Symmetry: C3
Subunit: 209 residues, 3 copies
Amino acid sequence: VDEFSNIRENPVTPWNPEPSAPVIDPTAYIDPQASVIGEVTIGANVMVSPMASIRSDEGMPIFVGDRSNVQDGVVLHALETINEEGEPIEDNIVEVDGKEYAVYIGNNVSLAHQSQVHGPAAVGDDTFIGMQAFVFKSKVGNNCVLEPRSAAIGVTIPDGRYIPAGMVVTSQAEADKLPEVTDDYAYSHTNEAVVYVNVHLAEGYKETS
Amino acid sequence: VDEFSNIRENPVTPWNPEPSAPVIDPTAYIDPQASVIGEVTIGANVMVSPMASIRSDEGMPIFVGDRSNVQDGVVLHALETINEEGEPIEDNIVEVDGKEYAVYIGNNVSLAHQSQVHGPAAVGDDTFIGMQAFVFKSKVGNNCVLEPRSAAIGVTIPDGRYIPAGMVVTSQAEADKLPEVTDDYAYSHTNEAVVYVNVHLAEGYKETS
Amino acid sequence: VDEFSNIRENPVTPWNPEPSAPVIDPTAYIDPQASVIGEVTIGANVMVSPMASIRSDEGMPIFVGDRSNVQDGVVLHALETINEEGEPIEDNIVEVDGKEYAVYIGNNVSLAHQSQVHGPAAVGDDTFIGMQAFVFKSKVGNNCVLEPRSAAIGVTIPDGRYIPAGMVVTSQAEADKLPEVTDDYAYSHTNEAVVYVNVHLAEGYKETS
Ligand SMILES: [Zn+2]
Ligand SMILES: [Zn+2]
Ligand SMILES: [Zn+2]
């Protein structure tokens, strides 16, 4: 009757000679119905909600910074980062200040319910990635806001910008023209409130396990 | 090897002094791979499918009426409903005839696969919320239809209207102009059939547990 | 403390006199946190990822061909295929060369993370169904590409075409006009690489169980 572990090593594959187990800070809370697999780093005070799936078995590594949250049904996965010659595929590798990642999720970042960040991708600190939104082959700057159902594919979202709900951004020209987050923007304080809440949820939930 | 309960209390937090466990009608069926947490009310004959996540740990309470269904990977969650003074945040509280809710899902409502209703939100009786659709900060009337991939954010959808597939409705002006459901509309009988089916699935599945 | 099986029979219902258990090739890998229910056929070398839900309890049967993959949070489900007279509802039945299915997923097909194929539907061989995409009441040909967040509802996508990211195709006229996949198209080699990877992941993961 379905006996198993939800935090585990990635399997041996032609691009993964030696398996890795997730490296998770004692202060992070991983829901029992979340799945965390392979070459993953999870930082302090991170909340991982039911049904999230963080799978570092193809592209690796996948890093989630401190005080960030990975909400219900969020998926983190990436395109192959090493070839057949054990050759790093640089096109599928993201570089975040001297360190290489398949997926890099910064500090104080919110991955809201049912969103997905697929590598190669980087999401900078204090950014809110909206409900059902999508990031793939992109670098989202810090202090950004992806409204619900927006997407960034193959682009760089400059620091401090936002993507209106439903908008799919596929070109650098359009990413260059995004609106700026200002004090009066409707999602201007959303991330700070969410981060506050989720740090407190992680602690509350750690006291139930 | 991952030992746990999928129906459980919310954690103690600064806004939740005392934990609550879900209140679920004996005739509802909660799939073993669904997650139901915290201040939740689930009505009679409700079917909750694999991978759904109903989490009342921030905004609360979350109510699902009789004969409604919460399909695979559907997420129900809400913005904080109480502040730091144990102060009710009225902007994040929905009012459904004398009673206050973070998320209110009426009777005979279908939350189709991978949709999401995030509070503050109310969905009126006999409404079909389409596959992958999204409701957030909105009141959807009764006898409505959100086609697949449609969304209602920050609006009121009048009774008897529908939102074409893919359409993101963010303004009251646009919500005011939605088309009416008529006998010949393609989704006119969709909800009644779905409700019929899911009430019967709940009973069938209850006989397997 | 939540004791259960993730691969199981569908329940007895008015349209399902006798329950069926999934028929899964020994070489397929079904993640322990995936759910597979009812009248399902899973072919060889298929990888089913965490949080996927394949549920054949309404419309049936649901078939997934050899060397195909059903990624994280993907949902497969279908509209009722038999009435009250045990009457086959031909409108909700798809025909794939002499055999009838509620959902037919061909060989070497990739159902990428958080996508969904809802029957009646057929997806032809070597097609990539993008992240968060949607197929419902449609026949997607072989060698197609649904980019991330695209959708096909009520149409036939001819062989060798693609749907740009975010595009919702609801009419045969628009499906007739889709662009062709060519050697230089950005997703032209995507499916073959994904299929290669997932066949190898299935084998790797089978060696961990
Ligand atoms: Zn992937
Ligand atoms: Zn939420
Ligand atoms: Zn369905």
